[PDB]
Subunit: 338 residues, 5 copies
């Protein structure tokens, strides 16, 4: 039988096929088995609280109307134009903020039918998905970004989604993220929705994204240690040199306030304390105390008498050992906690 | 003799297709009273609240319900039928648009995110997923302790009040997805519903409205704005414990604190529209500018009265600092009592 | 007569209507009467020199072919799908940089026909329109933004536009702009174009936008007075304290240069002097002179002799009264001029 | 003859017209005569190295099939819907980075046919065109931005483009650019392309854009003179005041480094020396030398002896006349060169 | 007389032709061999942050369709109107690493269709593609990147459809095409990327461009203005030791400038969590400036008492540091530049 004629009798003019009617229409729900191949994964944005992904979305279901016997082939690879002629699930991504198909140089779609009327339908999609983030432990945080596959119009009695048993979520080889590590384990679960319009099938995959620490040492943690260590050189400087010790005390405090506000500059304006906020606040005290240390040294040494110049002397020889020690004690706590 | 039921293909053809004689260019009860459309929205997502562009984004399911006697059926016992959304093009449906929408789009991946359900008696349920960007004019007088009312107007474009009328559902008109959070605001449980009925030179058009109340969260602004400003004001005070002879130290300390406080002040408006009125944060930064600027003028006085090295004036200058060490922290504490209690 | 049949005889299959032919085709030009309702007005950008608007564009003309007698109704509200079946003007916005229709949840269009064949056609549009700006007096400037309604293909002998006599441009109640005031008076005029392709109808509406001064006091003028007043505290400071007076003189000059460049930072790079440039330049002199004042005080007082220390003393006691006075004299001039 | 019937017989059902076949199909190439009206000209971006333009693109050619005798009119203004029914050139802009048609409120298109079968076809387009820039002399530079009109599918034997003899490129009256001057002279030339697919017609127009100098005096050149003049006030300051002269020397150098990096901040990261880079580098030396001048004054005056204090004195009295003179000598050279 | 074009197209691929574009050439036979070549019209928007790059190309595909062979004209080939492309079968080539792509439709579809006597097809289409290009920034800004471009079939397995590059001149680049940040190396690697998914084995061919980053900007913007801050730190040693505020201020300002200089060098880059060549330089430049201040901490501390022995002991340090630091920094640059230019 010619392909042209075969398609016409299976789903075309002479077929009597109606794509407005689901498989097993009077019967039980259609079982759609999903699996995704992740071609690309990125644009993870804390500010807009979302992430971008390029996938092949594979759907599999049975349509008895599409079973065939005219060829011995186990399956037939059909031109995707025929996808408009057949029924197919109305899968949408519940947490999608934006999405598009791919049409260059032709519709990036795949349609394969099997002797027994099983269908394989792969489509390439780019999705931007919302990923609400808890930044409590930033930048030693770990985020769980999700992806929900849902039916828009079919209730649970007509259409049901399910993940493949074997290898539901595959990721392209050598796929890397510059800020995060994509953990091998993906959680799969049901998100089944109940609205006033009914109960709708929904299945979910959770990606775990562990943020890489390295950049923040280079950009945030090391250049702050360097400002705290700079505040300590004041104690080896002569007490008579007020402008020098004060200027050194001021500059370190103002650098540490811009350093502090600059650490939140690529983040959403969440109204809770983050792990980086703690560090910058504690680093603000250790620098701000260094100036108050000189306020004390300058004030007790007002009169030039030997008793007070040596009393003021005592403070610096203690502070030279106390602050580096106290800061070392703080880092022991801080890093071990996180 | 219980014969087989009518095929769906044939049934759709007789109800709204070729053989039906249905005309979607004609409303239900066309010569009669207006069509009553009952609306309800499910808020899937709520965000991108922008002070600068004075708007906000939302992803919703917009449910519309009305009666079309033409679509009543008796061929199946089912209370309702879930139809393929392709059939939405074949039937009449309201021309609802969002009056305050700055941008809007449908969702087509992986298919049109639409729902069509018809009932025995010809009632229709029509749900469509939409992303809308809606204008929300903001009063920033009390920023950042402000509370905004963002609205959403559902309106007919072509049907006057005698042909088409909108109305909110009595039970649960506006539902919000579970665990939906906004990082900057709290979305208040109470939503006001009201009529926005428009009169233009083209006629009187139905319009119904929902008002969301968004209370801004204070926390970030303590961390970013209020605490780092207290810290600059407290820094200005360490000048008074410093020896009066050290002019460059006290002056530098006085200058640096004033310039930090001007960049601090301009940086607080940097993510806001250029409104031409005084905000609550402008007050705080202006008062914080005085308490730091006065600290330098305090030393101008100490340096000036102590010109000659005589005991009488060095002690006179001494008097000022021992007063200022207690006065400014006290005066600033008195200001915060007022400021915070007012807002 | 049934509506279905009536539409079919007026503009459909059996009608013989041809939308490729204008009304009164062999006769005089079609008179299109325009009016706009401004739903929204904003995104006024100095940098890109344009502004955004959301309008209902109402067009009215007569089509004798669409006259009817089958119903007593003065007019009929038709489904907008019928707009494709009828002729209608080819109005475009000559100064539009971008524009779009509105399709959610259906085409935001209105079609109303009258017994005598008059048509009312309202369409919702979002337009971004170019508005060239003169920034000479910024930020005490006032801009005139325009909007040109023009025919693309019809010459003046076939199609003519005209504003409504009564209430051509309506604005939504309580519509506010945060940076400007939209003046009640709108100028209407003809922009009739002559190209090598012919003479084409064009009508224009000019909006007057007066910029609100308030922000610029808060952000620009007050924080500059504050830097000029800071430069003056140098004169009450002891002349022996060189580092203090110099540092105070320097910091005020550098703050005043960043203050000056920061005032143009949200503007296009026009190559002419603006009113804010004058103020920042004069404010730069009054601060820069304060440092040159100390250069003089430090230089004439080189030797510690009584004659020169008192000579240097003379300068500051003059400068303490002269600069505040001279600056007050400048503001009298400056503000009264603008 | 009725218009409806006339269009049917000329290009419609009964016409036998086939728009897949060019005019004079077995004969010589079709001569398309182009001319553009520039409605708008802007968004000239150094960073992305391109510019935006809104034009009416007029094309003229002869189609013997479209000649008519049924009306006395020299030409007929047809509804643009008829453009789909007729053959027309496949002109594209070879250097277009993005482009769009205009559809509000209808397709901004014009179709006019003449007795002898000549066609006039005007279409409104917005084009973003690439304009590679030489920034050697920035900001006293002059750029040549081009626009190439090319056929995509027709080789030179089937289709040839050519500019109008009279007035090929017209510009709207009072069209201004805030950063540049658009020079009256436009060069026209042939860009005829040879690819492995064949030899394709291409014609070009070159615009000359001379950058306006004014902004850069206000923003860049004057505020740098002001920092260089500030460095010179150090020489009138007492040599004993080390912190004052040093602070004044430092602040001027750091301001001059941010001033230098801030001058390239709106430019692409080209790897060659620009005219503004020279000026900022020379301005960096004259300020940096002023501090090295004090290093010398402070170092030779170590011991308080009269011989060295006067030796150090000598340097400043020379530097007070030398640097302003040397800088004046530099500007003579610099400005006269450019 | 010859056959009319209208009739000829109708018999070859139109109504009367019986052609079915849903069936590939040699459908029951071996795979279709598609020979690709690209002309690069433009190459740019290379972004480190988003880790991708833009390109405008003519994508030429060549294959044989026996159904399209003709004898009615002597012409070796026929240039057909691209509307006829919808009437014929053609490969489903897509760019595997494309992040975004579009066709060009102004003023008409930028497409080319040419058929030959023997049924060979030439099909050129203009495309703009944004392609992902993962970058290794270890040696930035003396780095060299390899950006790729993968041509792949979406639906045809290797037994039905195979891609292959042209032997002669597969990738042509427009004359005088320049990139402002990089040099595009003449040598392009071609290779096979043949993919195996759970849906099957799909043809894929690849071209690798080599982009060498130009050094010049970074001298002007990054390396020279940092040498200038390190040289500024050295003028402290020629300054009198008694002038504490001057030497300290000079020591501080240089350190803070060098921290903003350091953070500003990463400001146009993605937040990679590894050490780059510019990070090394800024860190070493931070030490040479930070040591200069610690040098004065030592000079100020050993000279506490005004005695001749210690003032001369402190004196010794500066006369060593005046020769040591410029020497030590020169020794560092010898190492640094030779490492990143002798490798
Ligand atoms: C056959 C369809 C649908 C329909 O159009 N009709 C006329 C009937 C008739 C009798 N009983 C049920 C129906 C519905 C349900 N079936 S369906 O299960 O194939 C179907 C088809 C399309 C759907 C849908 C359900 O929900 C979302 O869109
Ligand atoms: C039946 C329609 C509309 C129409 O087309 N015709 C021919 C008539 C005839 C007689 N009387 C009224 C009409 C109008 C009104 N009706 S309608 O109520 O169904 C209708 C239909 C569509 C509409 C509309 C009103 O306003 C918005 O767009
Ligand atoms: C009847 C139309 C137009 C046309 O298409 N034809 C065939 C003829 C035939 C005879 N005489 C004139 C015409 C022209 C002019 N008229 S029209 O005035 O209705 C018209 C119709 C469409 C137009 C237009 C003018 O300007 C551009 O778009
Ligand atoms: C007549 C067309 C084109 C064609 O379709 N056929 C069938 C033939 C037949 C015989 N000889 C030549 C052709 C070609 C050439 N002509 S054409 O010159 O009008 C033409 C038409 C369209 C074209 C084109 C050339 O190149 C670009 O796209
Ligand atoms: C002829 C097509 C396709 C088809 O539609 N039918 C009906 C049959 C019948 C018998 N054997 C195979 C087929 C398949 C395969 N062939 S095809 O090689 O021309 C083809 C055509 C289109 C394709 C495709 C393969 O891969 C996906 O897109
Ligand atoms: C769907 O199919 C899987 C096997 O493919 C089966 O295990 C599962 O139970 C099915 N679910 C339903 C509701 O039929
Ligand atoms: Zn897990
Ligand atoms: Zn309320
Ligand atoms: Zn006026
Ligand atoms: Zn020239
Ligand atoms: Zn190679």
């Amino acid at each position: 039988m010619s392909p042209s004629d075969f398609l016409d009798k299976l789903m075309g003019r002479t077929s009597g096929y109606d794509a407005r009617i689901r498989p097993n229409f009077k019967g039980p729900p259609v079982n759609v088995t999903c699996n995704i191949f992740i071609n690309s994964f990125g644009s993870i944005a804390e500010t807009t609280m979302d992430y971008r992904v390029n996938i092949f979305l594979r759907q599999k279901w049975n349509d008895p109307r599409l079973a065939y016997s005219e060829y011995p082939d186990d399956s037939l690879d059909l031109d995707p134009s025929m996808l408009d002629s057949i029924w197919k699930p109305d899968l949408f991504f519940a947490n999608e903020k934006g999405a598009n198909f791919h049409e260059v140089t032709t519709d990036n779609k795949l349609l394969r039918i099997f002797k027994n009327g099983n269908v394989l339908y792969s489509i390439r999609l780019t999705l931007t998905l919302s990923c609400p983030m808890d930044l409590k432990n930033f930048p030693m945080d770990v985020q769980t970004c999700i992806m929900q596959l849902e039916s828009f119009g079919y209730t649970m009695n007509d259409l049901i989604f399910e993940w493949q048993d074997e290898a539901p979520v595959q990721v392209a080889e050598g796929l890397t993220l510059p800020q995060f590590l994509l953990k091998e384990e993906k959680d799969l679960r049901y998100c089944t929705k109940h609205y006033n319009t009914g109960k709708f099938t929904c299945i979910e995959v959770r990606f775990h994204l562990e943020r890489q620490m390295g950049y923040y040492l280079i950009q945030m943690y090391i250049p702050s240690l360097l400002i705290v260590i700079l505040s300590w050189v004041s104690f080896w400087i002569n007490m008579d040199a007020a402008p020098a010790r004060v200027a050194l005390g001021i500059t370190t405090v103002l650098t540490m306030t811009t350093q502090s506000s600059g650490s939140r500059a690529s983040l959403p304006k969440v109204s809770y304390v983050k792990a980086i906020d703690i560090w910058m606040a504690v680093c603000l005290l250790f620098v701000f105390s260094a100036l108050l240390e000189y306020a004390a040294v300058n004030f007790v040494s007002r009169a030039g008498t030997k008793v007070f110049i040596d009393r003021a002397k005592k403070i610096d020889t203690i502070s030279r050992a106390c602050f580096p020690l106290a800061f070392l004690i703080f880092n022991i706590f801080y890093w071990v906690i996180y």
